[PDB]
UniProtKB/Swiss-Prot annotation:
Cofactor: Mg(2+)
Catalytic activity: RNA(n) + a ribonucleoside 5'-triphosphate = RNA(n+1) + diphosphate; a 5'-end diphospho-ribonucleoside in mRNA + GTP + H(+) = a 5'-end (5'-triphosphoguanosine)-ribonucleoside in mRNA + diphosphate
Active site: S86, D87, D88
Activity regulation info: Inhibited by Remdesivir antiviral drug (GS-5734) through non-obligate RNA chain termination.
Part of the whole protein covered: 5066 to 5200 of 7096
Protein name: RNA-directed RNA polymerase nsp12
Length: 135
RNA sequence: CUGCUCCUAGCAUGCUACUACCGCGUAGCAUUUCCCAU
């Protein structure tokens, strides 16, 4: 037969490939979530300036811009922590930011999956925890 | 197929300790022999 696509299982790099794929999904969901928010009701200048710079470096600049990459990576480390196994991950994220939709959220993941993987991830499968005593 | 762990066996290496003998080196103690022509 002929395999249309999708990762195999008997190879030696499925785990690392899936990890990289997961990181990419999370990062693109964060980028999508930030850029779909009105800039007229944003908090302290910093984030609004960052969003403006992001749109410019995304659709107007042609080549790469390293410093903005470092800054955005540091921002993600500041307000988004991920622990990644092969297609399995746990996220610790600041909640007041997510209240205003300035970082990821489950609805963003649903939308990203719907338009980028052709699958509808029902939200009843996810879990969200507010406490940190229990793990 | 990757990663983690247990257990077993063997090997090999390193290191430590013990025992024996050896000789060395040092020190102490003590003795045994005592010499001759062309």
């Amino acid at each position: 037969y002929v395999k249309p696509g999708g990762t195999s299982s008997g190879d030696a790099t499925t785990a690392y490939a899936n990890s990289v794929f997961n990181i990419c999904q999370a990062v693109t969901a964060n980028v999508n979530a930030l850029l779909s928010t009105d800039g007229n009701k944003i908090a302290d200048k910093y984030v609004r300036n960052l969003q403006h710079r992001l749109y410019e470096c995304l659709y107007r600049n042609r080549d790469v811009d390293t410093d903005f990459v470092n800054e955005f990576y540091a921002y993600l480390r500041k307000h988004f922590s991920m622990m990644i196994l092969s297609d399995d991950a746990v996220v610790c994220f600041n909640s007041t930011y997510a209240s205003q939709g300035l970082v990821a959220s489950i609805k963003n993941f649903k939308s990203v999956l719907y338009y980028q993987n052709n699958v509808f991830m029902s939200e009843a499968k996810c879990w969200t925890e507010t406490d940190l005593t229990k793990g």
